[PDB]
Design a protein around this ligand. Sequence first.
Ligand SMILES: CC[n+]1ccc(-c2cc[n+](CC)cc2)cc1
Ligand SMILES: CC[n+]1ccc(-c2cc[n+](CC)cc2)cc1
Ligand code: SF4
Ligand code: SF4
Ligand code: FES
Ligand code: FES
Lengths: 633, 633
Amino acid sequence: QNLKSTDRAVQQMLDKAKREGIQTVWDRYEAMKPQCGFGETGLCCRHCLQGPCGILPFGDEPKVGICGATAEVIVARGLDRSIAAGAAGHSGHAKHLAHTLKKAVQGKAASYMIKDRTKLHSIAKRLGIPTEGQKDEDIALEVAKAALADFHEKDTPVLWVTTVLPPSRVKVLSAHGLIPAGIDHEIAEIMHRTSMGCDADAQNLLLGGLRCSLADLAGCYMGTDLADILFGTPAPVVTESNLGVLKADAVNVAVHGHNPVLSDIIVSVSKEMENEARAAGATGINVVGICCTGNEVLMRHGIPACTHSVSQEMAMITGALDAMILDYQCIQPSVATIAECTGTTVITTMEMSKITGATHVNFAEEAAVENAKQILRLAIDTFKRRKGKPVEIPNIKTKVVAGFSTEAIINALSKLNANDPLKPLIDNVVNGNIRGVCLFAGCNNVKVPQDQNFTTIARKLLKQNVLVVATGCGAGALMRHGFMDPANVDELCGDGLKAVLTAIGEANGLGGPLPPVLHMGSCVDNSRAVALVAALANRLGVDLDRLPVVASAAEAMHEKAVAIGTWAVTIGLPTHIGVLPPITGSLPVTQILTSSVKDITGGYFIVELDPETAADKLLAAINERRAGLGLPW
Amino acid sequence: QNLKSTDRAVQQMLDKAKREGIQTVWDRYEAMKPQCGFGETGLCCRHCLQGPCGILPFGDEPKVGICGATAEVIVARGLDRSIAAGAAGHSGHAKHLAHTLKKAVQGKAASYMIKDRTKLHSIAKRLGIPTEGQKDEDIALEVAKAALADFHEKDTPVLWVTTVLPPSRVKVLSAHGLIPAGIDHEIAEIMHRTSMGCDADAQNLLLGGLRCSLADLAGCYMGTDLADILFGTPAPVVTESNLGVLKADAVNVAVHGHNPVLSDIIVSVSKEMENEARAAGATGINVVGICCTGNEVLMRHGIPACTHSVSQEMAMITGALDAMILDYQCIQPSVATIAECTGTTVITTMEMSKITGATHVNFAEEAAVENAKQILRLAIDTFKRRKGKPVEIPNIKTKVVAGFSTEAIINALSKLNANDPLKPLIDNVVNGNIRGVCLFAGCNNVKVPQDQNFTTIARKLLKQNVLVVATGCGAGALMRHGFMDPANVDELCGDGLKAVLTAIGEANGLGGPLPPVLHMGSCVDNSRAVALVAALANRLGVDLDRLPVVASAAEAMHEKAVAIGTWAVTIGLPTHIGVLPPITGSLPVTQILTSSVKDITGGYFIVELDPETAADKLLAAINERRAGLGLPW
Ligand SMILES: CC[n+]1ccc(-c2cc[n+](CC)cc2)cc1
Ligand SMILES: CC[n+]1ccc(-c2cc[n+](CC)cc2)cc1
Ligand code: SF4
Ligand code: SF4
Ligand code: FES
Ligand code: FES
């Protein structure tokens, strides 16, 4: 049972679900085995009606597609479409945020406003939008219009690419034609070139995929920018994680998905419906988070992290989850069925993301408070239906210190050097106190036992003084196993890393160290790491592919994770992926994505499914980057 | 051997290829069997790294995806992505045309110009772009800017949707939220909603797919519009089809792909290099067409149709094909390999479409004549290498009368009624002389013996007085079996259809009838049929779903064909598809796409793999539409 998840509460709820005959994601995975060898090697194509075409990894015919598409062509086309799908997800997230900001500053959504004036000003200056002597709503409208225009061809390339990376990096990517012209333009061109009879050259397809991954990076950066403008830039905050944050005597409302435009309003309206909740016979409206919108409200408001990714269903298995408010992106549709057994009202709110069997509430920024009142009223009804009945909420919760936006990190460092905030960090990088930086990102994969790779690699990296930051469900796993709790620094961190964390934390008025891992936010907030990594780059006069910075999609599952890893490579990072991507069916594509892209961008993928070996490989990558700079290791 | 193709020349070249051990598409198809039952039923998903997930069509587990995605959800997501890929192809085609027009009228491409002033004026009037008292290049620039803007969100919806269908049809599609906001916007939203954890409601996904199919329709209409502005609106023309159009004593240059922006320049520059060809020891530069760019030059310049679709390789099997100029879209990459055995120089010209092993010439409208001179010089070299050596060009060619643009059709009808050109056609529809209209469209599929479905259904429809028009490789098949030759009217057409064709042809100054099938152009020129079908709609005061008009993707292969069939349904047509699409794995999705969409758009798919039964079903659909109007049948 410990082979399905390393989270103890998840094991408890798996026992409960097995008890009651509630089918789980691990059960469905067990029904799916043996899985198909063509697809999970990437050697399968259904790109037209002459298919499906499978190419045996080794042996006799079939060796080539019916139309003549080779193994590498098929592999590259599939990977390109994965990158495009992830880019579409992130880009639509940011597109909805841009629409919300425009509507707010045009007077069409009064529940939304400019909550971070300073970030709006700095973004407008970064884009060349004039701020001085201009109405705040005027420059916000201009910023939203620039964001919307970055989705198509225009006078300029994608500004959320070209103005967020150092100019030398932009030059390197422009010398290879990797700079995107428009986000949706790149997505459509990927869909065009990978369809039948089009592009059939592996190197060409992989370069196009790098461009599409940069479009995804632009989408992530824009989403972070607009969410910070509308809802505020996160600052350090203390909260709790895992299922134990649920309360049998409260109205449990879990916000699940990626777009915060809805759940941020939920967090506010719930406090106003506190009295209504009391009238129902409840202590209050206990709002918890699931997946990335949960991480957004965790970073901005200290909302507890109920659960993440592959184990989302386990929340409903408590029996005390009265509402699950879904927007889109990584909701298992199984919840809609599982609700029937758990007395959970599952509520979709977005037009392009509905699930069969769930109540739908058509969200609109013009009626966000109205929608939220209706939804939480349904949640109150659901609580009323279960008064006095038995629930099993595992009494398991960790302490989580989060809210480490790049702005907050720079400020906390400025406590040690007011005029050159990055200098203390670079100093400790030089003297060995900080070996390097690792970004943990991505989701949980049902094939990898939950949180095993993240915790294992994190332990091996922290004991060697790697400054570890995390986002999304990587942050979720590490926070559910105690890595955002400073009380574990002594157990987890090496001496130099402990000293650096202690120095910053004691300079930041909390008497103790920073938590062993810095939670940088959601899946799109990976852009935050870019913002940090580029900044240090600018401070050191070098390109990212010269920094001892690595990334780890240790348990990657989603197409967005593939796009994120691809643009982590593209901006120049060594990027470990801890699950097998569908590239092993063609040695040329694997060699390009792990070896020869070093000649193109300086980054490269590291495919390794053993977390001990993967941690050693990440350590070696960090140490080679250190050596290239002339640093001991 | 007749089981692989009904084209006699193709059978001859298949015998030659088998003789010499040249692997063919039919051979590769034979290596691919048995094909996978999950994919060709649509019951397979690889939309994230937890897959591949297969759902058995019948029996025990696996019954549901690992994440809980049902059979219908998986089927709808796959079909949605197919529609998006086809839309991306057509839209990128039209996008490149828009860029070429803008560059031409800004002074950046002197080889391109406004060749149809009248079509530019009428398009500008249809869009509300003011023509009166404006420079032709100014309104052309405005038209190109509107075309480019239709690819993203703006003040208005997609104008190439909303201004080309009758306003009642636009109202019907707007009542269901089917009107696209932007072409690339819709494509990206399809990629977003079909990725993991997003949309999981079959009806929702299919409605989104209808919207994306309308985006594809807009792309087709825009491509036709811009190609007509730059290169001219086709008029009737006489030429020849099949391999016999190749000449052993000429420099054989075959233009292959979809975008005419290149091959139209090739057609002109070749005549200027005629003297160079003579110097090489050749009679001239024999330019032939393959697939849809070949059909474009056939409709505009009377360039012979060498071959189409699944049999393209057979051209190289003649041994006398010296050059194959590929842009993109439906080129079998096998040609790049097959060239090594046939002495054929295969030349890619587009950045996003290269093939491993082929010479690449970077095309640019700023250097189109320069590129063309280089490419045809390589072709002359290739001819020089083969002087006096043996070739086998089958002496098989049919007569093809084509160039039937909607403008040309309206003019030919105006010969019978100068002020109400559509009235004679509607008159003969009423009195039974014309039973209905069938649009043949789409490609050849290696599973269906080549051209069998097209010819069979065409015979059964023509003998019952259906006015038959065709595009793309449907036109290619029907023209290679003699359906564009008026000399066959007596053999093919029923008495009333023969009388109508004879009346129009004798009124049009050629003493004989029109050909049994009206060639309306390329794959995007399906929009032409829309232009006709809408026009009659406007003349009759009814919606398309009330017209006795049907469509037939009789041997569909490409994702573009799926998108085309979907928007044929969406605008309200009964639409037969003659190959199995990946929808039969879910009865609900099949029922929606064949039965209940009648309540939504009035059109519906007809899935039938037997061409006799399919022809009967098309006949019955035409007759039901006749009955709804109160007409005998
Ligand atoms: C022959 C087709 N095929 C290729 C690869 C695998 C596979 C790869 C990695 N892992 C995790 C170690 C498991 C399975 C299974 C099947
Ligand atoms: C069980 C999986 N599966 C489903 C359908 C077919 C199939 C369908 C139609 N045709 C043409 C008549 C051939 C095969 C084959 C396999
Ligand atoms: S595009 Fe090629 S490999 Fe893919 S299904 Fe079609 S014929 Fe097979
Ligand atoms: S999205 Fe669902 S059905 Fe598709 S591969 Fe992932 S888990 Fe399987
Ligand atoms: S045959 Fe298994 S993924 Fe296609
Ligand atoms: S298992 Fe055959 S298409 Fe995926």
